[model samples]
Target chain A: VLYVGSKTKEGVVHGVATVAEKTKEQVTNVGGAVVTGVTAVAQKTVEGAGSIAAATGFVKKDQ
Target chain B: VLYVGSKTKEGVVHGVATVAEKTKEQVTNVGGAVVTGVTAVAQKTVEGAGSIAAATGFVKKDQ
Candidate 1:
């Protein structure tokens, strides 16, 4: 009975820990992708703006 | 142009950071629920086993 109780406690604790660890891993994976996606969009927007500015001859160097 | 570039970079970094933060928040929320679910299952299993053991009268007190 004591042995069974001890083993049960150990198993429960281990199970909980495993769940928490996997949760962290999954969260990091998704979070990284989201951040990367946002960064790409921002980069494209800036590049598009630059192209517009250049085409309009907005950049002028004074002598 | 330099000003625009600087602001663009800042915006991109800030946007990525925001996405990452939100992702973390979402994952934490989901992960917490998953952990709680696993814990509940474990608790139920242990209680079930205890009931079975009690019914079987397998628990013998040492004199």
Candidate 2:
């Protein structure tokens, strides 16, 4: 319900894409922390994408 | 009003640090957008860190 708003979901889309593009770029320079952090960002991006997609239906709020 | 709670700020600290570590990597594979997006995430991370630091005082909620 909180994230199901159209505007909010759109913002998440833009934000996720930007983060993915970012995480895809800085895949070096650092070592283990970077990898873990990249994974976290990537995971967050994926979660954001899924949330937006699921929110697309505006259905899960019922549950 | 928002983004001021201690736990929330701490989460931002961890999350921002992660994005920075991520953005500090993979700074080569992609092209212009990657740079732009990395800049975006880095900027957001900076903003997050600043917000958390500012919220540390727990004084901004005052009107």
Candidate 3:
């Protein structure tokens, strides 16, 4: 009787803590996703400029 | 007695579900952040180009 009551009390504590940890882990993941998106944009733009430069602007193909 | 046991069992299930929902909410926020970052970057660049067009180059100071 008392054992079950204590179990419920502790179980509630652990579950609340569980939610906090899970939420924080998601925060970490979200941080990385944002970093990934920005870096991807940077690379895409750089490759774009790279292609332009390689298409004769850098090596003087027509000159 | 049995009531306490059932309460703990159900409470555990609810806590796990709560964590999942909170984590997914973070995912939604992350998606929003990436979009907002890209949009802000594009806007700053477009306006920067316009600022250069008017504040410098051949636009003339008072013309």
- Candidate 1 CAPRI classification by DockQ: incorrect
How much lDDT does each candidate structure score? Answer: 0.19, 0.22, 0.22
- Chain B TM-score of candidate 1 stands at 0.11
lDDT tens readout by residue for model 3, A2-59: 4554543211212222223443332333322222111111111221221101111111
Candidate 2: Cα lDDT at A62? 30
Best by DockQ: 3
User: By TM-score, how accurate is candidate 1?
Assistant: 0.13
**What are the clashing pairs of model 2?**
A25-B26, A25-B27, A26-B25, A26-B26, A26-B27, A27-B25, A27-B26, A28-B25, A28-B26
Residue A17, candidate 2: alpha-carbon lDDT? 25
In candidate 2, the second chain superimposes onto the true chain B with a TM-score of 0.13
Score candidate 2 by TM-score against the native.
0.14
Q: TM-score of chain A for candidate 2?
A: 0.13
Worst 10 residues of 3 chain A by lDDT: A51-60
lDDT per residue as tens, model 3, B1-63: 455453333212122222233333333332122221111111112112111111111122231
The per-model DockQ list reads 0.02, 0.05, 0.07
Assess every candidate by TM-score. 0.13, 0.14, 0.14
How would you order the candidates by lDDT, starting with the best? 3, 2, 1
Q: Encode model 2's per-residue lDDT on A1-63: one tens digit a residue.
A: 232222221111122322243444333321111112221121122112112111011112231
